Here is the input.
Amino acid sequence: EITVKELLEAGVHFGHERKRWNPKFARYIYAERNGIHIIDLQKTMEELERTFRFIEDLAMRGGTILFVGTKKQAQDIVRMEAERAGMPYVNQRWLGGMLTNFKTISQRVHRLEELEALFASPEIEERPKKEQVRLKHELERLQKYLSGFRLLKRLPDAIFVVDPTKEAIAVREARKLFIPVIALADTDSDPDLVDYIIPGNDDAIRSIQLILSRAVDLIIQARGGVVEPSPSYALVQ
Amino acid sequence: DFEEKMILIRRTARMQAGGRRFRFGALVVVGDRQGRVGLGFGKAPEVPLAVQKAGYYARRNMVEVPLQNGTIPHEIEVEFGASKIVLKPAAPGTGVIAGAVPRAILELAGVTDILTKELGSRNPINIAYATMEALRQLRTKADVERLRKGE
Amino acid sequence: MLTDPIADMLTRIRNATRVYKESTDVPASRFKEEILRILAREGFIKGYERVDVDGKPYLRVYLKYGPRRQGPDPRPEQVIHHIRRISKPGRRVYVGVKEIPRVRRGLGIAILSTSKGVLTDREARKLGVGGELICEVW
Amino acid sequence: GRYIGPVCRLCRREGVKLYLKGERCYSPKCAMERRPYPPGQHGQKRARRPSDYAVRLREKQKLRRIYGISERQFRNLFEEASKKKGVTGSVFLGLLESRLDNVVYRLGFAVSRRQARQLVRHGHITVNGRRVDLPSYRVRPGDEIAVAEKSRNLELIRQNLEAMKGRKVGPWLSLDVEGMKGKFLRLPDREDLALPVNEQLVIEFYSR
RNA sequence: GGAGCAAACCGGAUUAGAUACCCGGGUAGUCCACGCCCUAAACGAUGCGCGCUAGGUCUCUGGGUCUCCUGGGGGCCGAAGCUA
RNA sequence: GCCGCGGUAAUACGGAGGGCGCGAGCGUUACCCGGAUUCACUGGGCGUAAAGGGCGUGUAGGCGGCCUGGGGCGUCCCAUGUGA
Ligand SMILES: [Mg+2]
Ligand SMILES: [Mg+2]
Ligand SMILES: [Mg+2]
Ligand SMILES: [Mg+2]
Ligand SMILES: [Mg+2]
Ligand SMILES: [Mg+2]
Ligand SMILES: [Mg+2]
Ligand SMILES: [Mg+2]
Ligand SMILES: [Mg+2]
Ligand SMILES: [Mg+2]
Ligand SMILES: [Mg+2]
Ligand SMILES: [Mg+2]
Ligand SMILES: [Mg+2]
Ligand SMILES: [Mg+2]
Ligand SMILES: [Mg+2]
Ligand SMILES: [Mg+2]
Ligand SMILES: [Mg+2]
Ligand SMILES: [Mg+2]
Ligand SMILES: [Mg+2]
Ligand SMILES: [Mg+2]
Ligand SMILES: [Mg+2]
Ligand SMILES: [Mg+2]
Ligand SMILES: [Mg+2]
Ligand SMILES: [Mg+2]
Ligand SMILES: [Mg+2]
Ligand SMILES: [Mg+2]
Ligand SMILES: [Mg+2]
Ligand SMILES: [Mg+2]
Ligand SMILES: [Mg+2]
Ligand SMILES: [Mg+2]
Ligand SMILES: [Mg+2]
Ligand SMILES: [Mg+2]
Ligand SMILES: [Mg+2]
Ligand SMILES: [Mg+2]
Ligand SMILES: [Mg+2]
Ligand SMILES: [Mg+2]
Ligand SMILES: [Mg+2]
Ligand SMILES: [Mg+2]
Ligand SMILES: [Mg+2]
Ligand SMILES: [Zn+2]
Here is the structure.
């Protein structure tokens, strides 16, 4: 569902950053109780609704969302939430021009489906073992970086970010491309440059997961058939 | 449909062991005379490539040139770097009064009659980039009031 | 010290809008309000309430801004693009009904104090007066 | 005084027919249907991208060379025209056409402007019934341009007027072919006559 | 007044030369008082006073209900903005 | 005129052919305004490009905070004369 209680959000899912902040978390900040800045969970909702409202309005009209999360705290959680939504993602090091230069970056996804469908083909042993290994090594390279980018043979209509700061690069072109920006960002990064914000702990899996996990449920409820709460509470904490 | 027109070309020069290499600069202006112009600067190892990629960039940049009958809505001026340009609106029958740089931009945007001067730095490149901002900052009586109604 | 209060306010405003904020205050003045009185009625701003700051009477001035644009620099357009003082204390500028300005071929406004109160580039011409030309805004 | 000598060469210096000749500059060529290129040893050679100046210089010479009028008398008009208000550019050609030697060329009394001058000059032309031997004469609404009696003959006039049958006059003129009389009805807007000349380029050339 | 130092000066070296750099001597001067001189890369190469426009960290010095907040200073990185 | 042309292939010297520009004129020199926004009232500068006085104190001078009243000098409107 799209509904979300303020109880399970009670773990760390509201500001974990302090003074390492951007002073533009004005509206999105409650108090500085004990070092860390705590985020007014109340406004989150309103920002959420406004955000989800666009997520469904876009998901229910057959769009595509690109997920970016290089962070290790929210690294794999994107892989399972992106694959569980059939949508593209960036689990590894985000490359420059992946959008503004998407045209040429794509050509390098195109090396992969030539390498991909040549692992079982006939003309394989014909090429000396000296030449092989490396190729599959290369193939492994491509997959590592392009697994969640392998799909989506065109620029998305919006992008979801685990943190606009860690990835400002990613928003910058996207933003240069008029592409709308959704993201979860703790007091670290500055809003404004964000179109639809998820004002909360962009670190600490507990918080992150909680969001995306359901969040992606709302993405499925855009076509119909929301099932099991996708992978999660694994070795969570 | 679009009318290309480069108003500046030059040969820079870098230097390396034994001799000096050259790139080429291309300043091209694009428009339609409807009220839509674009400006792009293209560098390339040779002449054409630049010119060609100038129009490429020049089409990536455009403008809402509001024309109150071959002129502009209000009196505007804009300072870019050390260079300054003056656009004062003129009544029909006057013509475009400006250097060979700015006129080339006003034409491709229509503009039947206007008064202008270049102040400070006369460097075309900076005059160019200075002129677009001017236009990119024009507001018709309509664009204005909208704001002065609020909510 | 404040060798010029009016200018201070104009600048007090100019410096707020540049950074985008909801309201900045400014020391109370009969003449100061009659000036803001123009900006409200001309929609250059919202309004203001004779607020108080520690016994000292100020004027919380409320600013309007265009719609949140998108792309690089989502910061909105300015409702008040430009504002500068004309008749300063170091040089007073006095003009007659025939020597009145012409801000942006109508697109702007001009504020001047006359023997018939605080008027506008227009009203001055309508009333048929003239006096100290305060500033210009657009 | 006025220009004298090679003119078909101009016909092709600007790269456009301008019918300064009678039949010829109007027959198969101003010597151009033969050679549509610029005079001088460097004719059959490619040209260099004409500068914004040379363009306005050329587009100007074109117009002045058309009415075959000195740079003197010429600019005097533009200034007088520019002095006015409205558009000036349009007003300009207005003062150009108002010339006496001009009206005559249009009213078919002569084939060429240079032939039209000889007429006015020698005194074989009239205006409201006056001997006007001055090609500089400016004409207004309703002015009658006919031939004088001493001249209402001449084997050259009948030919010119005769050829004028099977031909029309400007929306600002009217000829009594059979009587030798014509009238200046109004000042012909830019529309009333189309030309290889963009005035606006001539306006620019004068704001050096 | 004069220990140390040290323009000028003398001697030893180096060098083609070495009126220098290096070594050994050495006078004014460097020190005090009184009276002059009034210059300088006298520099932050940034005149003085007042108001307005994010913050982060280090340090000196106050005041407080003393994790902190608050005032006056002294550095660094930096919002917006200015700048060739 | 400025930038610069001439060193045995000079569209830059000298002549020729040809072309461009004007025409009883076409050139030159000199002088004034323009461009020069390059004295900047309109309409500029002073960290490193020329430019903050070596630093204070202070004279005259310029400038001056919130409310209310008299005066109405400046300022503003109208009217009239004069501005041949
Ligand atoms: Mg660029
Ligand atoms: Mg500047
Ligand atoms: Mg300059
Ligand atoms: Mg220049
Ligand atoms: Mg006119
Ligand atoms: Mg001129
Ligand atoms: Mg010695
Ligand atoms: Mg020796
Ligand atoms: Mg010897
Ligand atoms: Mg010694
Ligand atoms: Mg010693
Ligand atoms: Mg002595
Ligand atoms: Mg200072
Ligand atoms: Mg203490
Ligand atoms: Mg401090
Ligand atoms: Mg800094
Ligand atoms: Mg910046
Ligand atoms: Mg030779
Ligand atoms: Mg040579
Ligand atoms: Mg020469
Ligand atoms: Mg020669
Ligand atoms: Mg010749
Ligand atoms: Mg020649
Ligand atoms: Mg002369
Ligand atoms: Mg002039
Ligand atoms: Mg000044
Ligand atoms: Mg200057
Ligand atoms: Mg200063
Ligand atoms: Mg120096
Ligand atoms: Mg200096
Ligand atoms: Mg100093
Ligand atoms: Mg001083
Ligand atoms: Mg001194
Ligand atoms: Mg001093
Ligand atoms: Mg005093
Ligand atoms: Mg005083
Ligand atoms: Mg006072
Ligand atoms: Mg009083
Ligand atoms: Mg009078
Ligand atoms: Zn011909």
Observations:
- Chain B has four helices and nine strands.
- Chain B has two domains: 3-63, 64-149.
- The CA atoms of residues 28 and 145 of chain B lie 35 Å apart.
